């Protein structure tokens, strides 16, 4: 996965191997001081919310193995699964009084190698 977008908010495309510890970190590090920090698994799906108090997991399977760092705001997933591959959206409420949302298309790959297929016209 490499760069491939432009505008006032390029899309993030990360790629890792299945069953490996990943780390979701928004390009731009959290501002001076954020107010709200939540993670979205899908278009209308959440994973964990942080009300400037204590992380809150919304009955998300991830809960248990994953972990949300309120210091940086990164999501660490263990023994990830091919399914994990999805558009991640981290919504945060800026102190000033704004609302931003990033995007990360997680791309999981398989470890097992591949054979040597050759074609002879």
Swiss-Prot record:
Superkingdom, taxonomy of origin: Eukaryota
- What the protein does? Glycosylphosphatidylinositol (GPI)-anchored cell surface glycoprotein that interacts via its N-terminal immunoglobulin domain with cell surface receptors including CD244/2B4 or CD2 to regulate immune cell function and activation. Participates in T-cell signaling transduction by associating with CD2 and efficiently bringing the Src family protein kinase LCK and LAT to the TCR/CD3 complex. In turn, promotes LCK phosphorylation and subsequent activation.
Q: Which residues of the full protein are shown?
A: 27 to 140 of 243
Q: Where in the cell is it found?
A: Cell membrane; Membrane raft; Secreted
Give the multimer and partner information: Interacts with CD2. Interacts with CD244; this interaction is possible not only on different cells (trans interaction) but also on the same cell (cis interaction). Interacts with LCK.
Tissues and organs where the protein is expressed, per its UniProt entry? Widely expressed on all hematopoietic cells.
Q: Where is the Ig-like C2-type domain?
A: 10-108
Glycosylated sites: 21, 25, 85
**Organism of provenance:** Homo sapiens
UniProt protein name: CD48 antigen
Q: What is the lineage of its organism?
A: Eukaryota, Metazoa, Chordata, Craniata, Vertebrata
Q: What induces it?
A: By IFN-alpha/beta and IFN-gamma both at the level of CD48 mRNA and cell surface expression.
């Amino acid at each position: 996965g490499s760069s491939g977008s432009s505008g006032q908010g390029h899309l993030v495309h990360m790629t890792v191997v299945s069953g490996s510890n990943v780390t979701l970190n928004i390009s731009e590090s959290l501002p001076e001081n954020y107010k709200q920090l939540t993670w979205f698994y899908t278009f209308d799906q959440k994973i964990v919310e942080w009300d400037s108090r204590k992380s809150k997991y919304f009955e998300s399977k991830f809960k248990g193995r994953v972990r949300l760092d309120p210091q940086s705001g990164a999501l660490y997933i263990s023994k990830v699964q091919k399914e994990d591959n999805s558009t991640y959206i981290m919504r945060v409420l800026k102190k000033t009084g704004n609302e931003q949302e990033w995007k990360i298309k997680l791309q999981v790959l398989d470890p097992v190698p591949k054979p040597v297929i050759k074609i002879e016209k």
